[PDB]
Amino acid sequence: TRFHSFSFYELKNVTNNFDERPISVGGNKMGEGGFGVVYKGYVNNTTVAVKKLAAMITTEELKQQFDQEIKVMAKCQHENLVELLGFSSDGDDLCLVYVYMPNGSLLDRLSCLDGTPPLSWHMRCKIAQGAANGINFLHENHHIHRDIKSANILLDEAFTAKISDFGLARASQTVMTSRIVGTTAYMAPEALRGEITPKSDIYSFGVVLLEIITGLPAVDEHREPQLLLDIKEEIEDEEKTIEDYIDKKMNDADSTSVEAMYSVASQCLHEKKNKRPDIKKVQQLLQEMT
Numbered sequence: 169t170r171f172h173s174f175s176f177y178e179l180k181n182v183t184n185n186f187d188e189r190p191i192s193v194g195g196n197k198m199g200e201g202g203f204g205v206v207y208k209g210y211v212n213n214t215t216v217a218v219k220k221l222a223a224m225i226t227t228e229e230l231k232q233q234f235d236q237e238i239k240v241m242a243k244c245q246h247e248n249l250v251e252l253l254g255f256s257s258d259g260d261d262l263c264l265v266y267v268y269m270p271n272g273s274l275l276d277r278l279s280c281l282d283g284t285p286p287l288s289w290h291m292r293c294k295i296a297q298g299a300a301n302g303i304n305f306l307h308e309n310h311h312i313h314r315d316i317k318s319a320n321i322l323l324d325e326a327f328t329a330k331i332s333d334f335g336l337a338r339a340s341q342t343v344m345t346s347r348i349v350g351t352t353a354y355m356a357p358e359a360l361r362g363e364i365t366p367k368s369d370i371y372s373f374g375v376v377l378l379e380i381i382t383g384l385p386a387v388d389e390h391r392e393p394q395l396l397l398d399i400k401e402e403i404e405d406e407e408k409t410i411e412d413y414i415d416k417k418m419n420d421a422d423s424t425s426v427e428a429m430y431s432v433a434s435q436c437l438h439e440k441k442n443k444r445p446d447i448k449k450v451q452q453l454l455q456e457m458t
């Protein structure tokens with residue numbers, strides 16, 4: 169509940185003065201998003217993940233997300249969610265300290281970033297389950313994630329799914345905003361129009377399920393089709409099948425359970441929010457799959 173307050177200068181030292189070069193070329197950079205850069209850190213015998221908030225066009229605004237990340241982190245602690253260890257305010261330089269995830273993000277593991285071997289269909293089902301449980305806990309606690317994507321599903325040594333990035337998270341199937349925030353490749357139709365509903369989180373999870381099946385990122389500029397959702401259309405319009413897209417980097421994948429995960433994904437991806445299943449139903453269908 170109550171978080172440790174680190175001083176900016178402690179964090180600078182622990183991250184080799186926020187060395188922005190990738191860990192692959194001897195830097196501290198593990199990844200980046202639109203609102204910040206994540207660094208590897210070594211605080212008091214603990215390897216940590218330091219997210220330093222930054223405009224990658226946002227104002228501050230940034231501080232609103234900082235207060236929101238801590239507020240949700242204080243109330244939401246669970247087996248399938250990341251754990252915040254601390255924070256740093258000092259001027260415009262805002263940092264959040266997390267538990268270091270040895271298997272990084274689902275997005276990076278599906279693309280085998282840095283020579284990691286491809287994920288077994290067995291681990292993929294475990295991840296899908298864990299990721300769904302984390303969303304259930306957030307919803308049961310009247311919270312909408314708003315940024316469900318494979319980059320925001322982190323993995324430990326045992327490949328346990330851990331939902332991250334709560335900077336956009338909101339306490340709660342029809343609320344309204346103005347100013348649309350999130351990742352468009354994953355965003356539900358209603359979400360792109362201002363609607364704040366837990367049903368949007370489910371849609372996004374369907375996009376994640378297709379990435380899990382195919383090993384393909386939601387959007388790829390140098391791919392035909394660019395969008396993974398266009399391949400969902402091709403399946404539903406008999407122009408192609410799910411087998412034509414099952415990740416070729418698997419051997420333990422059986423069309424039986426693969427078609428089952430696709431069935432769940434298809435329901436998650438219903439155009440009309442009320443036709444989509446709730447998180448508890450998604451959980452049921454995934455536990456039924458194995």
Ligand SMILES: CC(C)Nc1cc(Nc2ncc(C#N)cn2)ncc1C(=O)NC[C@@H](F)C(C)(C)O
Pocket residue numbers: 198199200206217219250266267268269270271272273276282284322332333334
């Ligand atoms: C950056 C990402 C691609 N990557 C990570 C995120 C992370 N923790 C973290 N926790 C919570 C939040 C938030 N909000 C962000 N980051 N811990 C480790 C990583 C990471 O990259 N670990 C290294 C492994 F991916 C590997 C050794 C295979 O490179």
